[PDB]
């Protein structure tokens, strides 16, 4: 191929707080419209914002986990636009003087190599609400307005659709491991807008940038990108110029479309919110969050390989799905036979639960039961053949391995 894809992403991550960013209303999914609502978060006259401490704490932890420099002074600014789901006429975020800067995420590529994608910024901001369309009207639920978001911006360091997806998956897993957000696109805890240009291979200048908004799964961003790169290469080689705009992606067609509305953005008239003093982050607080950081995916990966002698194939599975690793370790704790437990977990239990449609957090076979079953296999109390018969019923019923051994004779 003659060209090169230059890809950047802008991600909004919903922070798993109890409370909104600027008032004490609950953050929760699928409540009755306009019930978790305030004078503050409703943009009512006379109502004033108050910063959420935990939101701040979580956003610092996120920043560090993303290897960013966390700035001891940042400032909330008012970002102005008129839209029905935006109560104040402005969104309170950060602009010049964001919380964190100059970071990186490391990707593990499927051909063996490790790449870095830079994090340009991480800032704190609040969410708008949601519109529903019904007939000639729009109905507005402001339950989500003022929910804490981390806006994360990538340098245009991504080169490949797969890499975009792999980036998103790694971010999600960091967020989850750090414990700052659930980060599932399904519940809209994670949004992603895509920026993409193409470039003759090895060139150092940037090509014209296209923006793709509202893609809704990690799979869909790979698809949108896959198509869009082709779309742009077609244009340039036909002798045309690629035009700077925003586009949309239809999942059903797997294609990206221009917009009928030629609506230019408008100056956001940014400036510090006079209702808020600057955010001052003591160094001692950063130090404390640093010291007490939960374990992160890349760290866990090397630890399992060492502490349990797992293969890179094995550890990768247990780490990419945190709760599987969590299960494994609680099991190995009951019976210290790691090699055996990963076998029966990966090769047997996981696929059995998949088939019933049950998540590992909620499996009838508790870590104790798998450790017990593997114990009977090692101690030659039952055969592998009989072991594969009792595991099937363990999932089916919920009874202990030694329960069903006796019930059906040893």
């Amino acid at each position: 191929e003659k060209y090169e894809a230059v890809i950047g992403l802008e991600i909004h991550v919903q922070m798993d707080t109890k409370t909104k960013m600027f008032c004490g209303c609950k953050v929760e999914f699928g409540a009755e419209p306009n019930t978790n609502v305030c004078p503050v978060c409703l943009g009512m006259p006379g109502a004033l914002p108050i910063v959420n401490k935990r939101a701040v704490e979580y956003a610092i932890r996120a920043s560090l986990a993303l290897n960013c420099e966390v700035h001891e002074e940042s400032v909330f600014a008012r970002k102005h636009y008129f839209y029905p789901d935006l109560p104040k006429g402005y969104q309170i975020s950060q602009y010049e003087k964001p919380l964190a800067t100059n970071g990186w995420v490391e990707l593990n590529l499927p051909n063996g190599e490790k790449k870095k994608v830079r994090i340009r910024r991480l800032h704190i901001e609040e969410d708008a609400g949601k519109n529903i369309h019904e007939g000639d009207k729009t109905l507005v639920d402001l339950n989500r307005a003022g929910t804490p978001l981390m806006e994360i911006v990538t340098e245009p360091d991504i080169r490949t659709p797969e890499e975009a997806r792999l980036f998103l998956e790694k971010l999600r897993n960091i967020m989850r491991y750090a414990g700052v957000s659930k980060a599932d696109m399904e519940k809209g805890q994670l949004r992603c807008d895509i920026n993409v240009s193409i470039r003759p291979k090895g060139s150092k200048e940037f090509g014209t940038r296209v923006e793709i908004k509202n893609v809704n799964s990690f799979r869909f961003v790979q698809k949108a990108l896959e198509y869009e790169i082709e779309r742009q290469i077609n244009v340039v080689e036909e002798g045309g110029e690629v035009v700077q705009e925003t586009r949309t992606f239809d999942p059903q067609t797997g294609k990206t479309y221009p917009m009928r509305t030629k609506e230019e953005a408008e100056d956001y008239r940014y400036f510090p919110d006079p209702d808020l003093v600057p955010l001052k982050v003591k160094k001692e607080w950063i130090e404390e969050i640093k010291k007490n950081m939960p374990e992160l995916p890349d760290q866990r990966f090397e630890r399992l390989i060492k502490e349990y002698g797992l293969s890179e194939y094995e550890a990768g599975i247990l780490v990419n799905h945190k709760e599987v690793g969590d299960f494994f370790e609680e099991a190995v704790r009951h019976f210290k036979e790691p090699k055996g437990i990963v076998n029966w977990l990966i090769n047997d239990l996981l696929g059995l639960l998949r088939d019933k449609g049950i998540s590992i957090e909620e499996s009838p076979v508790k870590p104790e039961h798998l450790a017990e079953l593997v114990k009977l296999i090692k101690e030659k109390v039952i055969s592998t053949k009989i072991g594969k018969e009792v595991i099937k019923e363990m999932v089916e019923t919920g009874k202990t391995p030694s329960q069903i051994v006796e019930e059906k004779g040893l």
């Binding site: 209303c25 306009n34 609502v37 959420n52 701040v56 000639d136 009207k137 109905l139």
Partner: protein
């Protein structure tokens, strides 16, 4: 200052000016822009923008506060439906 200027700024501000306001606001604003253009004279390189004094940033614990009753939250609404604020459709 232009008519074009008055409309552009009105747009950003979501004010559909009536034709009488457009001419009047051309002069009045032109005058006010002259009226307030005094500050170039001063040197403000090496001056920090004003902020009220404060030792720590005021923050609040992550604890739920009783929300506003939905009835009071909606009572002032020009149009409401099934718990939702109602406006003309947006695309």
């Amino acid at each position: 200052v232009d008519r074009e200027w008055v409309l552009k700024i009105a747009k950003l501000a979501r004010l559909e000016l009536k034709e009488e306001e457009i001419e009047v606001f051309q002069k009045q604003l032109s005058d006010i822009l002259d009226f307030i253009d005094q500050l170039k004279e001063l040197d403000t390189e090496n001056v920090e923008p004003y902020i009220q004094e404060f030792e720590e940033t005021p923050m609040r614990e992550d604890e739920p506060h009783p929300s506003l009753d939905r009835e009071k939250a909606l009572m002032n609404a020009p149009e409401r439906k099934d718990g939702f604020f109602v406006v003309p459709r947006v695309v």
